[PDB]
Amino acid sequence: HHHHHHMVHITLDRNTANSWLIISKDRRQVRMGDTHQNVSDNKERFSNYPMVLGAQRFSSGKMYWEVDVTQKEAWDLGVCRDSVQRKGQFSLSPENGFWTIWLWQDSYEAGTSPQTTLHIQVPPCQIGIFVDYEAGVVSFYNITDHGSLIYTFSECVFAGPLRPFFNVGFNYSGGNAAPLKLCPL
Numbered sequence: 069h070h071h072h073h074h075m076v077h078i079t080l081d082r083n084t085a086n087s088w089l090i091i092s093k094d095r096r097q098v099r100m101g102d103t104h105q106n107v108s109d110n111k112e113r114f115s116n117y118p119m120v121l122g123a124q125r126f127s128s129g130k131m132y133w134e135v136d137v138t139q140k141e142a143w144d145l146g147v148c149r150d151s152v153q154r155k156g157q158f159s160l161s162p163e164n165g166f167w168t169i170w171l172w173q174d175s176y177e178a179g180t181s182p183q184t185t186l187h188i189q190v191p192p193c194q195i196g197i198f199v200d201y202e203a204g205v206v207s208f209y210n211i212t213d214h215g216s217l218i219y220t221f222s223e224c225v226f227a228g229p230l231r232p233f234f235n236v237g238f239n240y241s242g243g244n245a246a247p248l249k250l251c252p253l
């Protein structure tokens with residue numbers, strides 16, 4: 069791909085984080101803590117899952133960023149509407165305002181309803197995410213495999229401002245403690 073020139077500097081929004089997440093001082097890394105991180109509750113925080121949003125809101129244009137997923141067993145990545153549900157149980161789907169892919173139990177899937185199997189020959193250590201607001205496109209790229217396409221959501225109905233979306237996943241196994249990291253431009 070040739071989307072690198074639309075690179076944007078993403079930072080994480082502490083106020084949206086699940087209360088067990090630990091965000092680095094530079095707001096570029098996030099990981100699951102082993103306990104509640106001693107923050108007050110608020111209506112923005114994702115309650116049920118280890119999720120957090122980027123601070124940036126996008127309503128036009130072309131945007132690109134990259135995320136490091138090295139040594140993780142489970143995670144979700146993509147974009148979502150600013151108005152997505154924060155509290156309780158929900159599925160990641162375009163009907164609920166999410167355009168995402170994930171790793172779970174040694175398989176990669178796109179967050180369609182129902183979910184779509186991905187075909188990845190080279191497990192990615194870094195993911196590139198491209199959003200074209202006007203075109204209604206969200207695309208995912210395998211940076212480890214020379215930028216190869218993973219998945220394209222097209223005919224997207226964003227229906228509002230978009231925010232970068234992250235889920236570090238649970239760590240029931242003891243093998244999923246590693247952070248998500250926003251990679252340098």
Ligand SMILES: CC[C@H](NC)c1ccncc1
Nearest residue numbers: 086088115116117118238
């Ligand atoms: C408290 C249940 C669960 N422990 C892994 C949990 C659920 C949601 N956020 C953080 C942690």
